């Protein structure tokens, strides 16, 4: 059992580091590098980034945070704190009660199922087709970002982003994917240098920063025929009824005038990889040499062609009618990158609500509600599992505890008041950050995407089994 104890002591330390990193009033942590560096960041990811750990159990706490961050853009410290206390509250049950780990693991699985029931009960519905409410929802949900003054479009930019990527299928034949979204890949955002944040806009298709060769050119073709070529030849182009000539390499005056004479535009410096992206949204054939051009060079599925210059660079619009490109505008590439730091975070907020159209009672009301509902289930559950089942209830009280502790209130009395408010009162009673008072989430909204709480509990119990199932730490190469 001594080896399992050492695994428990690992997570307790990981939690003690992250414990006070939760909240708008969160206490700062001091990262001391051996070279004399000192960072006071409140980013629990950065805290976990530098924490040099000994027990591989702590390494699994880091892999746990990676798993949460990769899937759900939030949940970092919620999972670290939740998962750690789930293990910690089981400690006297392992050591003193002499409960075999298999019994403990089986009990946690049953608590997971029951916990998901409570999470559903406390949920609040929200209509994702009410764009006006989704704007008020996402704008409040992204709370505390750098683009508060630009949050109007920094919110709407993400709403119009997820508007289209929604993986929409619903039927009893194959099932409902539930609007699965891939912000990393399916969405290709094209950040445009120049403009301001509020000038940012959303397009449909692929947008390239490859500029135009001649200032006089056919500006818009509603139904073009696009020739994707890399390299007599200028005449060969026109044989296939083209309207747009795109060249991979640089372009001289001869290609400007000969193709313009026939009403064809000239585009340079477009790599075959951008020519493939053109094929994704239109369908023209990629060709190297002009003497190899064939009748398959077509400009299908091309809704709009636009050649406007923004930011000392002409852009080629490949617009068509799980893919989208946003025409984000920013005074500099660093402003464009600042947009990502705040905008893509909103994309995750919208991904969560688009994943499930349901909200969670915040201020810690979700967790204290679970701690009450599990208690009623525990006394009604027969077996040795009466002991470990209560461990989750005591662990679910840590999250609301840290909200009180970082608020400066009495960490003992305020929790007991929360217990009575959830016992006889409504499940919507939470913790106010600024006042430090017990408040109802009807008054102070803070409604959180439910899937954050669902995945947080799932990944916490999952990792708890990974930490309990280890019987010894053995050396081997």
């Amino acid at each position: 059992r001594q080896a399992q104890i050492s695994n428990i002591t690992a997570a307790k330390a990981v939690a003690d580091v992250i414990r006070t990193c939760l909240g708008p009033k969160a206490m700062l942590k001091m990262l001391l590098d051996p070279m004399g560096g000192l960072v006071l960041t409140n980013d629990g990811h950065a805290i976990l980034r530098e924490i040099d750990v000994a027990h591989p159990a702590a390494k699994s706490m880091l892999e746990l945070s990676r798993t949460q961050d990769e899937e759900v853009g939030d949940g970092t410290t919620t999972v670290i704190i939740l998962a750690g206390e789930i293990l910690a509250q089981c400690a006297p049950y392992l050591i003193e009660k002499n409960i075999h780990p298999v019994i403990i693991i089986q009990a946690l699985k049953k608590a997971l199922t029951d916990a998901l029931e409570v999470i559903k009960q406390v949920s609040k519905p929200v209509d994702v087709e009410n764009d006006a409410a989704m704007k008020k929802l996402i704008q409040a949900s992204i709370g505390t970002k750098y683009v508060i003054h630009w949050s109007e479009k920094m919110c709407e930019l993400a709403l119009d982003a997820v508007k289209t990527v929604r993986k929409d299928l619903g039927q009893t034949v194959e099932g409902e994917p539930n609007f699965e979204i891939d912000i990393k890949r399916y969405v290709r955002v094209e950040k445009i240098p120049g403009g301001d944040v509020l000038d940012s806009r959303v397009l449909k298709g692929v947008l390239l920063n490859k500029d135009v060769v001649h200032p006089k050119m056919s500006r818009h073709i509603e139904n073009p025929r696009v020739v994707l070529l890399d390299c007599l030849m200028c005449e060969q182009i026109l044989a296939v009824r083209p309207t747009l000539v795109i060249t991979e390499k640089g372009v001289s005056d001869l290609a400007q005038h000969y193709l313009l004479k026939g009403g064809c535009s000239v585009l340079r410096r477009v790599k075959k990889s951008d020519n493939n992206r053109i094929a994704r949204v239109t369908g023209a054939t990629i060709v190297n040499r002009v003497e190899d051009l064939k009748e398959s060079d077509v400009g299908t599925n091309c809704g709009l062609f636009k050649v406007e210059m923004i930011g000392d660079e002409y852009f080629s619009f490949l617009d068509n009618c799980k893919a989208c490109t946003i025409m984000l505008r920013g005074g500099s590439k660093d402003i464009l990158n600042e947009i990502d730091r705040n905008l893509q975070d909103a994309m995750a907020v919208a991904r969560n609500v688009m994943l499930s159209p349901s909200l969670s009672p915040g201020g810690g009301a979700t967790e204290m509600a679970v701690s009450v509902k599990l208690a009623e289930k525990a006394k009604q559950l027969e077996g040795i599992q009466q002991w470990p089942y209560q461990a989750v209830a005591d662990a679910m009280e840590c999250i609301p505890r840290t909200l009180i502790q970082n608020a400066g209130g009495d960490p003992i009395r305020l929790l007991s008041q929360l217990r009575a408010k959830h016992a006889q009162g409504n499940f919507t009673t939470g913790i106010d950050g600024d006042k430090g008072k017990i408040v109802d989430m009807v008054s102070y909204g803070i409604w959180e995407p439910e899937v954050i709480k669902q995945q947080s509990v799932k990944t916490a119990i999952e990792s708890a089994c990974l930490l309990l199932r280890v019987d010894d730490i053995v050396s081997g190469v």
């Binding site: 040795i384 009466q386 960490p411």
Partner: protein, 506 residues
């Protein structure tokens, strides 16, 4: 944290008693600093021999002295309840609940527990002083001392008890049964079936006289003298021996006891004529002879005033286990106020330890006296498990941080049904959850029927769950429980209140 250091200290004596209590308990080897091997289950004997180090232990030890002196049982109930009441307080301390708030909680629970104990009453000993009513209590008292030997010890005690409880009727204001009413002696050799009970006094010293028996008459009169017997010395200085018995016998005396030395001729003549001679080194035992034979010691010499003679039915010299003893006893009359337990047993530790157990059984009967001592509670943690459920109900009824303390208060009463299991060898991961369900039922009624009788199985009858206490007639003394709760609650309150240990000026 002084309270944390105190918790560490109590963990030592908690480990001592946690494995001690119960008929399946484990013995402790105790080495006396004067060179005596003491092997016993009695934690009071343990703590008497255990040197006390941490001052917080002094609280717990003196608490057990309050229990043992004032009540002839409850020794481990104090140590066991106290150990866990302070163990569970570690959770309350670590949750941030202050010492005064924990103290306030246990005091609030003191009221809740005492009121519930009055409702846990199952039966009541109607004070018939009948062997059957005595056995209902003597058996469970002898239990926890020697498991399975109750048959030998119950017949020994319940019959010995009938010797010191005389025929009494309409008597609730007349006290009976002094602790010294039953004497226990040790004869090396034999086994349990070789033990017996004498209806009177037995002198562990071998026969000192040459006379074996008195006459055959009933109520042989007897004399005790205080002054040394010799040729009559005048009232002052002096710088007849046998004539004493010529004076004594006038009233009907066959037996002559001398509380002092013996003169020349009487040493021969007192025994020559068939009269028993006695000199007792124990002077309190001379006061016992005042109670057994009824003999009033004569303060003067050679002048047995009629009022200074008693009436004793039969005095003979008897052979016990091959080692001779002298018996001054009563026989169906002038009923003896003392009865002697004859323990024959070859192992001096088991022989002495059997006495230690019977000593406690004698003490239990002292608590079977009239002071509201007939109340019975359901044994084998049926009291403890039912208290757990009723305490948690008071938690639901109690607002405030006191709810946290009450919750941990109930957890503490699990140490008793747990100890009954850990010593008995049934899986605590199975017995304890079965106890919970056995006592926690939805009764179609306000009176739990057959669900307050659920017990803890210490027997080898393999069964999933637990047994019914009425099978063996296992009942606990209410007064023992009620007094123990008061002692442990206040004792733990004391330890929970120690904020700093300061050395006095030296």
């Amino acid at each position: 944290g002084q309270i944390i250091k105190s918790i560490a200290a109590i963990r030592e004596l908690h480990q001592m008693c946690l494995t001690s209590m119960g008929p399946c308990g484990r013995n402790k080897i105790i080495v006396n600093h004067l060179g005596k091997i003491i092997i016993t289950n009695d934690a009071a004997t343990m703590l008497r021999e255990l040197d006390i180090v941490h001052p917080a232990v002094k609280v717990l030890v003196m608490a057990t002295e309050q229990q043992k002196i004032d009540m002839g049982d409850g020794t481990n109930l104090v140590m066991i309840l106290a150990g866990e009441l302070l163990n569970v307080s570690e959770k309350l301390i670590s949750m941030g609940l202050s010492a005064v708030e924990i103290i306030q909680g246990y005091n609030m629970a003191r009221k809740f527990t005492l009121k519930e104990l009055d409702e846990m009453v199952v039966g009541e000993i109607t004070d018939k002083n009948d062997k059957n009513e005595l056995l209902k209590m003597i058996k469970p008292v002898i239990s926890s001392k020697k498991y399975g030997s109750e048959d030998i010890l119950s017949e020994l005690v319940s019959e010995a008890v009938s010797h010191v409880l005389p025929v009494a009727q309409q008597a609730g204001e007349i006290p009976y049964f002094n602790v010294d009413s039953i004497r226990v002696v040790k004869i090396m050799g034999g086994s349990l079936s070789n033990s017996t009970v004498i209806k009177g006094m037995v002198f562990n010293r071998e026969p000192e006289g040459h006379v074996k028996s008195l006459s055959e008459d009933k109520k042989h009169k007897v004399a005790v003298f205080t002054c040394p017997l010799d040729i009559a010395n005048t009232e002052t200085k002096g710088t007849q021996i046998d004539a004493m018995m010529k004076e004594i016998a006038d009233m009907g005396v066959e037996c002559i006891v001398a509380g002092a030395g013996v003169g020349e001729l009487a040493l021969h003549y007192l025994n020559r004529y068939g009269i028993l001679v006695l000199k007792v080194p124990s002077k309190f035992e001379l006061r016992r002879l005042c109670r057994v034979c009824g003999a009033t010691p004569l303060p003067r010499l050679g002048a047995p005033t009629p009022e200074e003679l008693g009436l004793v039915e039969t005095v003979k010299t008897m052979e016990i286990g091959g080692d001779r003893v002298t018996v001054f006893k009563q026989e169906q009359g002038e009923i003896s106020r003392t009865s002697t337990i004859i323990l024959r047993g070859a192992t001096q530790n088991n022989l002495d330890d059997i006495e230690r157990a019977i000593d406690d059984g004698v003490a239990a009967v002292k608590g079977l006296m009239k002071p509201s001592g007939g109340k019975l509670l359901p044994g084998a943690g049926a009291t403890e498990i039912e208290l757990i459920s009723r305490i948690t109900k008071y938690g639901e009824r109690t607002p405030g941080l006191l709810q946290l303390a009450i919750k941990q208060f109930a957890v503490a009463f699990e140490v008793v049904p747990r100890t009954l299991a850990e010593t008995a060898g049934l899986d605590v991961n199975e017995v304890l959850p079965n106890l919970y369900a056995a006592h926690n039922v939805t009764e179609p009624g306000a009176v739990k029927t057959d669900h307050l009788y659920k017990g803890v199985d210490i027997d080898g009858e393999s069964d999933e769950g637990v047994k019914d206490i009425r099978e063996e007639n296992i009942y606990d003394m209410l007064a023992t429980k009620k007094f123990a709760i008061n002692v442990a609650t206040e004792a733990a309150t004391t330890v929970l209140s120690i904020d700093q240990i300061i050395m006095a000026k030296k």
